[PDB]
Protein backbone atom coordinates (compact mmCIF):
# COMPACT_ATOMS: atom_id res chain seq x y z
CA UNK A 1 0.00 0.00 0.00
CA UNK A 2 1.15 3.59 -0.62
CA UNK A 3 2.92 5.34 2.22
CA UNK A 4 1.24 8.37 3.76
CA UNK A 5 4.02 10.42 2.21
CA UNK A 6 3.39 9.01 -1.21
CA UNK A 7 -0.24 9.83 -0.71
CA UNK A 8 0.38 13.37 0.38
CA UNK A 9 2.69 14.03 -2.54
CA UNK A 10 0.08 12.79 -5.00
CA UNK A 11 -2.61 14.92 -3.31
CA UNK A 12 -0.34 17.96 -3.60
CA UNK A 13 -0.06 17.47 -7.35
CA UNK A 14 -3.82 17.06 -7.56
CA UNK A 15 -4.18 20.31 -5.59
CA UNK A 16 -1.73 21.97 -7.95
CA UNK A 17 -3.73 20.83 -10.98
CA UNK A 18 -7.00 22.05 -9.43
CA UNK A 19 -5.19 25.34 -8.47
CA UNK A 20 -6.06 24.87 -4.79
CA UNK A 21 -2.77 26.16 -3.47
CA UNK A 22 -3.65 26.54 0.21
CA UNK A 23 -4.43 22.80 0.26
CA UNK A 24 -1.26 22.09 -1.76
CA UNK A 25 0.66 23.84 1.04
CA UNK A 26 -0.88 21.65 3.72
CA UNK A 27 -0.11 18.43 1.88
CA UNK A 28 3.53 19.44 1.44
CA UNK A 29 3.80 20.53 5.07
CA UNK A 30 2.66 17.07 6.16
CA UNK A 31 5.46 15.68 4.00
CA UNK A 32 8.04 18.10 5.42
CA UNK A 33 7.02 17.56 9.04
CA UNK A 34 7.22 13.77 8.52
CA UNK A 35 10.95 13.92 7.70
CA UNK A 36 13.58 12.28 9.85
CA UNK A 37 17.22 12.89 8.97
CA UNK A 38 16.35 12.67 5.29
CA UNK A 39 15.45 15.67 3.18
CA UNK A 40 12.85 16.43 0.53
CA UNK A 41 13.36 15.28 -3.03
CA UNK A 42 13.89 17.89 -5.72
CA UNK A 43 10.29 17.30 -6.76
CA UNK A 44 8.92 17.66 -3.23
CA UNK A 45 10.94 20.79 -2.45
CA UNK A 46 9.69 22.33 -5.68
CA UNK A 47 6.07 21.38 -4.94
CA UNK A 48 6.36 23.10 -1.56
CA UNK A 49 7.93 26.20 -3.10
CA UNK A 50 5.31 26.37 -5.85
CA UNK A 51 2.49 26.01 -3.33
CA UNK A 52 3.78 28.81 -1.11
CA UNK A 53 4.62 31.00 -4.05
CA UNK A 54 1.03 30.78 -5.27
CA UNK A 55 -0.55 31.31 -1.90
CA UNK A 56 1.55 34.40 -1.15
CA UNK A 57 1.36 35.62 -4.74
CA UNK A 58 -2.40 36.03 -4.76
CA UNK A 59 -2.15 38.17 -1.63
CA UNK A 60 0.73 40.25 -2.98
CA UNK A 61 -1.29 40.86 -6.14
CA UNK A 62 -4.34 41.90 -4.12
CA UNK A 63 -2.11 44.07 -1.92
CA UNK A 64 -0.71 45.92 -4.93
CA UNK A 65 -4.16 46.61 -6.39
CA UNK A 66 -5.46 47.87 -3.05
CA UNK A 67 -2.36 50.05 -2.56
CA UNK A 68 -2.86 51.71 -5.96
CA UNK A 69 -6.47 52.51 -5.12
CA UNK A 70 -5.43 53.88 -1.72
CA UNK A 71 -2.79 56.18 -3.18
CA UNK A 72 -5.34 57.42 -5.72
CA UNK A 73 -7.95 58.21 -3.07
CA UNK A 74 -5.20 59.89 -1.03
CA UNK A 75 -4.49 62.26 -3.91
CA UNK A 76 -8.11 63.52 -3.71
CA UNK A 77 -8.35 63.89 0.07
CA UNK A 78 -11.23 61.44 0.02
CA UNK A 79 -10.79 60.19 3.57
CA UNK A 80 -13.76 57.91 4.23
CA UNK A 81 -12.76 55.83 1.24
CA UNK A 82 -9.15 55.89 2.40
CA UNK A 83 -10.11 54.44 5.73
CA UNK A 84 -12.09 51.63 4.22
CA UNK A 85 -9.39 50.89 1.71
CA UNK A 86 -6.90 50.66 4.58
CA UNK A 87 -9.19 48.41 6.56
CA UNK A 88 -9.09 46.13 3.59
CA UNK A 89 -5.35 46.39 3.18
CA UNK A 90 -4.83 45.52 6.82
CA UNK A 91 -6.75 42.32 6.29
CA UNK A 92 -4.58 41.34 3.32
CA UNK A 93 -1.45 42.23 5.29
CA UNK A 94 -2.52 39.90 8.11
CA UNK A 95 -2.72 37.01 5.65
CA UNK A 96 0.70 37.95 4.21
CA UNK A 97 2.19 37.85 7.72
CA UNK A 98 0.57 34.48 8.50
CA UNK A 99 1.68 32.88 5.22
CA UNK A 100 5.26 34.11 5.60
CA UNK A 101 5.33 32.94 9.20
CA UNK A 102 4.27 29.44 8.12
CA UNK A 103 7.07 28.86 5.68
CA UNK A 104 9.62 30.76 7.75
CA UNK A 105 8.97 28.52 10.77
CA UNK A 106 9.12 25.47 8.57
CA UNK A 107 12.38 26.61 7.05
CA UNK A 108 14.33 26.90 10.33
CA UNK A 109 12.56 24.03 12.14
CA UNK A 110 12.79 21.34 9.42
CA UNK A 111 14.06 22.32 5.99
CA UNK A 112 17.32 24.20 6.62
CA UNK A 113 18.58 21.73 9.29
CA UNK A 114 17.88 18.86 6.85
CA UNK A 115 19.72 20.34 3.85
CA UNK A 116 22.68 18.13 2.95
CA UNK A 117 23.96 19.50 -0.37
CA UNK A 118 24.86 22.91 -1.77
CA UNK A 119 21.74 22.81 -3.96
CA UNK A 120 19.26 22.47 -1.14
CA UNK A 121 20.98 24.83 1.30
CA UNK A 122 21.01 27.66 -1.21
CA UNK A 123 17.44 26.77 -2.19
CA UNK A 124 16.16 27.05 1.37
CA UNK A 125 18.21 30.11 2.40
CA UNK A 126 17.04 31.98 -0.72
CA UNK A 127 13.48 31.01 0.22
CA UNK A 128 14.12 32.43 3.67
CA UNK A 129 15.36 35.63 2.05
CA UNK A 130 12.35 35.74 -0.27
CA UNK A 131 9.80 35.45 2.50
CA UNK A 132 11.40 38.06 4.69
CA UNK A 133 11.50 40.26 1.62
CA UNK A 134 7.74 39.89 1.10
CA UNK A 135 7.25 41.10 4.68
CA UNK A 136 9.55 44.08 4.04
CA UNK A 137 7.38 45.02 1.05
CA UNK A 138 4.53 46.35 3.19
CA UNK A 139 6.06 47.21 6.57
CA UNK A 140 7.55 50.53 7.61
CA UNK A 141 9.89 51.94 10.22
CA UNK A 142 11.17 49.51 12.81
CA UNK A 143 9.30 46.41 11.59
CA UNK A 144 10.57 47.15 8.09
CA UNK A 145 14.12 47.45 9.14
CA UNK A 146 14.00 44.15 10.88
CA UNK A 147 12.58 42.43 7.81
CA UNK A 148 15.22 44.07 5.70
CA UNK A 149 17.99 42.92 8.00
CA UNK A 150 16.62 39.41 8.00
CA UNK A 151 16.38 39.43 4.21
CA UNK A 152 19.95 40.63 3.78
CA UNK A 153 21.39 38.10 6.22
CA UNK A 154 19.57 35.20 4.51
CA UNK A 155 20.52 36.21 1.00
CA UNK A 156 24.13 36.73 2.06
CA UNK A 157 24.33 33.29 3.64
CA UNK A 158 22.80 31.80 0.49
CA UNK A 159 25.21 33.63 -1.79
CA UNK A 160 28.31 32.59 0.16
CA UNK A 161 27.38 28.96 -0.45
CA UNK A 162 26.12 29.51 -4.00
CA UNK A 163 29.19 31.29 -5.34
CA UNK A 164 31.53 28.67 -3.88
CA UNK A 165 29.47 25.55 -4.49
CA UNK A 166 27.17 25.99 -7.55
CA UNK A 167 27.94 26.80 -11.16
CA UNK A 168 27.19 30.36 -12.36
CA UNK A 169 24.58 28.92 -14.73
CA UNK A 170 22.69 27.04 -12.01
CA UNK A 171 19.07 28.16 -11.94
CA UNK A 172 19.02 28.45 -8.15
CA UNK A 173 22.17 30.56 -8.03
CA UNK A 174 20.82 32.73 -10.85
CA UNK A 175 17.45 32.93 -9.15
CA UNK A 176 19.18 34.01 -5.95
CA UNK A 177 21.05 36.76 -7.82
CA UNK A 178 17.86 37.98 -9.47
CA UNK A 179 16.01 38.21 -6.17
CA UNK A 180 18.97 39.64 -4.28
CA UNK A 181 19.27 42.35 -6.87
CA UNK A 182 15.54 43.01 -6.63
CA UNK A 183 15.93 43.31 -2.87
CA UNK A 184 18.55 46.08 -3.20
CA UNK A 185 16.33 47.83 -5.74
CA UNK A 186 12.83 47.61 -4.24
CA UNK A 187 13.53 47.43 -0.49
CA UNK A 188 16.85 49.24 -0.08
CA UNK A 189 16.07 51.68 -2.94
CA UNK A 190 19.69 51.25 -4.08
CA UNK A 191 19.67 50.88 -7.89
CA UNK A 192 23.47 51.14 -7.98
CA UNK A 193 23.98 47.88 -6.05
CA UNK A 194 20.99 46.25 -7.68
CA UNK A 195 22.58 46.73 -11.09
CA UNK A 196 26.09 45.71 -10.09
CA UNK A 197 24.88 42.46 -8.54
CA UNK A 198 22.53 41.62 -11.42
CA UNK A 199 25.20 42.49 -13.94
CA UNK A 200 27.88 40.44 -12.26
CA UNK A 201 25.65 37.37 -12.05
CA UNK A 202 24.63 37.76 -15.68
CA UNK A 203 28.24 38.19 -16.79
CA UNK A 204 29.56 35.14 -14.91
CA UNK A 205 26.78 32.98 -16.38
CA UNK A 206 27.53 34.23 -19.91
CA UNK A 207 31.21 33.47 -19.39
CA UNK A 208 30.46 29.92 -18.25
CA UNK A 209 27.95 29.43 -21.07
CA UNK A 210 30.53 30.57 -23.63
CA UNK A 211 33.22 28.13 -22.44
CA UNK A 212 31.65 25.10 -20.72
CA UNK A 213 27.95 25.19 -21.55
CA UNK A 214 25.40 24.25 -18.91
CA UNK A 215 23.25 21.17 -18.37
CA UNK A 216 19.81 22.80 -17.77
CA UNK A 217 19.80 25.48 -20.43
CA UNK A 218 16.07 26.12 -20.35
CA UNK A 219 15.88 27.39 -16.84
CA UNK A 220 19.02 29.38 -16.84
CA UNK A 221 17.97 30.98 -20.06
CA UNK A 222 14.76 32.28 -18.70
CA UNK A 223 16.28 33.65 -15.52
CA UNK A 224 19.10 35.36 -17.41
CA UNK A 225 16.55 37.01 -19.66
CA UNK A 226 14.87 38.21 -16.46
CA UNK A 227 18.13 39.65 -15.23
CA UNK A 228 18.50 41.49 -18.50
CA UNK A 229 15.00 42.78 -18.41
CA UNK A 230 15.57 44.29 -14.98
CA UNK A 231 18.92 45.80 -15.98
CA UNK A 232 17.33 47.41 -19.04
CA UNK A 233 14.41 48.74 -16.99
CA UNK A 234 16.54 49.98 -14.11
CA UNK A 235 19.22 51.64 -16.24
CA UNK A 236 16.75 53.35 -18.57
CA UNK A 237 14.92 54.66 -15.50
CA UNK A 238 18.22 56.03 -14.15
CA UNK A 239 19.07 58.18 -17.19
CA UNK A 240 15.46 59.49 -17.14
Amino acid sequence: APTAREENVYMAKLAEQAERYEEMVEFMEKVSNSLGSEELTVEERNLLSVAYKNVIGARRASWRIISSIEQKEESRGNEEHVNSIREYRSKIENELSKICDGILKLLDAKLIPSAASGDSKVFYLKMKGDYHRYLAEFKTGAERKEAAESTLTAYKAAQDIATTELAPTHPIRLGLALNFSVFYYEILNSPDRACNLAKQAFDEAIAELDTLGEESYKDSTLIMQLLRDNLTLWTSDMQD
Binding site: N179, V182, E186, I223, L226
Partner: peptide, 7 residues
Amino acid sequence: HLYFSSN
Protein backbone atom coordinates in the same frame (compact mmCIF):
# COMPACT_ATOMS: atom_id res chain seq x y z
CA HIS B 1 8.52 52.99 -11.39
CA LEU B 2 8.43 49.72 -9.46
CA TYR B 3 7.48 46.07 -9.94
CA PHE B 4 10.43 44.29 -11.54
CA SER B 5 10.77 40.66 -12.25
CA SER B 6 11.66 38.15 -9.59
CA ASN B 7 12.18 34.42 -9.41
